[PDB]
Amino acid sequence: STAGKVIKCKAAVLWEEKKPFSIEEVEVAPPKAHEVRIKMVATGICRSDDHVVSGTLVTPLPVIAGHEAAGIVESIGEGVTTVRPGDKVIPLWTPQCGKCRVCKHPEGNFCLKNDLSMPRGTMQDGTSRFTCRGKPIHHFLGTSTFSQYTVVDEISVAKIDAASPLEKVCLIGCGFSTGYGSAVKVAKVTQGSTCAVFGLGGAGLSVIMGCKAAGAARIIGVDINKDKFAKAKEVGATECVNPQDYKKPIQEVLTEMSNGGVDFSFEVIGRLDTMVTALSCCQEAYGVSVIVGVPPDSQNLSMNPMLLLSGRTWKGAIFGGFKSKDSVPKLVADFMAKKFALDPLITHVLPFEKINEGFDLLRSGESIRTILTF
Amino acid sequence: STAGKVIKCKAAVLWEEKKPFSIEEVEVAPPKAHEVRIKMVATGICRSDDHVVSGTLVTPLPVIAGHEAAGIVESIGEGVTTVRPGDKVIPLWTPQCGKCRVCKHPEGNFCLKNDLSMPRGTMQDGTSRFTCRGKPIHHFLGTSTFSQYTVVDEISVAKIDAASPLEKVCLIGCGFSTGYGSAVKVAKVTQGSTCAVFGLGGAGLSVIMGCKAAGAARIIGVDINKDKFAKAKEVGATECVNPQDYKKPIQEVLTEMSNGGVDFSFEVIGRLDTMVTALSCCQEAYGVSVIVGVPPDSQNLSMNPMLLLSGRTWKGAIFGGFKSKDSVPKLVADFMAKKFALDPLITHVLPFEKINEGFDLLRSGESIRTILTF
């Protein structure tokens, strides 16, 4: 009843930066060869989507943002083998074409066929499957999840568990996996180690969950906001430290506490000042500090190279270093296996109509993860 | 004829920074429990020794510098089990007490019982085995090789091959191993990879030799001095690139050449500007850049964290990441196995008396490695 035809649905359209979203009547052109048109069931609200509004993350406007979401596959274009309609799936904003240097590398995940480095806000072919009143509307990271219907290439889609609670597994599209992966895939936390996590947002609680999956025995959560200590502890942190409690710098107190600097340090804030500090507090002779995320408008951080000479690794990553297509199904299955839980992060669920409302929550103040439902 | 007694010998004493060395009549007190008094056969001249003179590397003055050298063990104090006199050995400026976090870690090498972080210029006990005309003379990195006789703790000494040509294996005490290790132990170059080396000094040629031992198929040597291209090529670089030849920045041209950035980038110069560039030119999604060495007077390098988000590892290290005591013997054996050669680096051998003369060569202009002989 929809397959093969242009669907007219509602979606949050950003006509211009620094403007609220407009729930628009949009047309979602059918999917061509290797495209898959999905039915959004749930999409989360993430800082990255908010960056677009501000201009910080420059990508073509007008646009339908959204990249953390899970839904049901309605139609599949030609050659689509990885999915069949009815499939619970999660759009992947970091692809896995399985053919470039990066996908072929046993480590890298940042697929070359991504639309992050040099945003086009289009599908692979250079075109757009969106139009509002005849006017073409841009795609975001080849996903555009703030729409009741979306069309993503086959490389930007992943089949997940049919029993997946879509109001909760959507987190695995960005937030959870970006954190969890930093600990379990990038930094590669080890049984016994002592981790320190800067920032206790949702991405933070995910890193803490990763460290726990890894076996870290000590997970020190650090945040200038005391109110973030409960979740974190409840989520896994064995102790939290509010930097404004001391008279000395935190890395000093993280070293004293750790007796020589932590094994792995994670920064899930985005400050440049804290970025250096997170490095400065891991073991000088073998500490690994991971920058989980950086503001896309960031500038030059001032840092003394001595920090690295000691033998300190500094790593960055996109999407918790997971190889999206390969990984997402497995992250899901695990959640489905009753390992990690995603609830403590979902602090709000709002009907998709309340999108602009979900953002204010994000923007000003704490709302770990707001899940917008369709 | 010497064992158990205070030896009176000659050594280069630095009475004050920014002063030439004085070949001094010094007394070398016998070795206590766990000390080993060595007979220097050969010691190389390294930038680090020169830093001391300048003040750059702050360590107690007066002092007998030197840390890259190999010789013969004359007497061994109490409990010394790792050596017996007659033993060809190499002092290790980065210890291996085999008891701290670092030695116990399967990776770190920067032994806690080092004298680099907070120089004391003494042996483990806080004392000095040196005196010139009754006045006590400081030790350097617990080695002090610019002396015909020296006393190093057992953790700062390594037994090598009895067939070791000491005029050539001394390189394995700092220079060679610092480079070679950056490629083969820290960055961990892989069969097939494409490496890029900034700076073609001796430490550079050593990194290139490491990459070769690893299997890198492409080893791009970069240096503003055309005259360094022969050795490097001869040593392993498949092609060298002089940055002053182009109109565009080098990392640009290293990426164009490598089609997407090199696999591993090494910086064996010490510039802060080049440090960032070396990072900026390795694969954004999985490139590892290694800072082989940094000036001990360095300042804050300005760098945009975006560089790491892509998935770029940045690592530093001391002594090519080798675990000195465990490693040195094996590096030697390998050389002795006719694998790598150390000759192309030894561009000068000068009688120890000509020490101040060896430095001018180091200081002003190219002299890959000057070996001072006893």
Ligand SMILES: NC(=O)c1cccc([C@@H]2O[C@H](COP(=O)([O-])OP(=O)(O)OC[C@H]3O[C@@H](n4cnc5c(N)ncnc54)[C@H](O)[C@@H]3O)[C@@H](O)[C@H]2O)[nH+]1
């Ligand atoms: N928004 C996301 O879902 C998301 C996803 C992936 C990566 C990230 C990275 O995590 C960064 C923050 O977003 P988030 O972690 O999900 O949540 P967030 O932006 O609410 O969390 C940042 C946390 O760090 C805290 N903080 C601020 N300053 C300091 C400081 N000086 N020292 C210690 N703690 C401090 C702050 O209180 C908050 O708890 C984000 O900016 C991005 O760089 N965020």
Ligand SMILES: NC(=O)c1cccc([C@@H]2O[C@H](COP(=O)([O-])OP(=O)(O)OC[C@H]3O[C@@H](n4cnc5c(N)ncnc54)[C@H](O)[C@@H]3O)[C@@H](O)[C@H]2O)[nH+]1
């Ligand atoms: N001196 C040593 O034996 C030694 C040992 C271990 C580590 C190191 C590291 O290597 C650093 C240099 O000492 P070395 O490599 O043994 O020899 P070095 O100091 O003679 O070599 C530095 C090389 O880099 C070259 N160079 C300078 N500027 C540039 C630039 N802008 N771009 C490209 N190339 C440039 C320079 O021509 C020289 O060939 C040293 O400062 C230290 O940080 N050095």
Ligand SMILES: [Zn+2]
């Ligand atoms: Zn996101």
Ligand SMILES: [Zn+2]
């Ligand atoms: Zn790819």
Ligand SMILES: [Zn+2]
């Ligand atoms: Zn040296």
Ligand SMILES: [Zn+2]
């Ligand atoms: Zn040790």
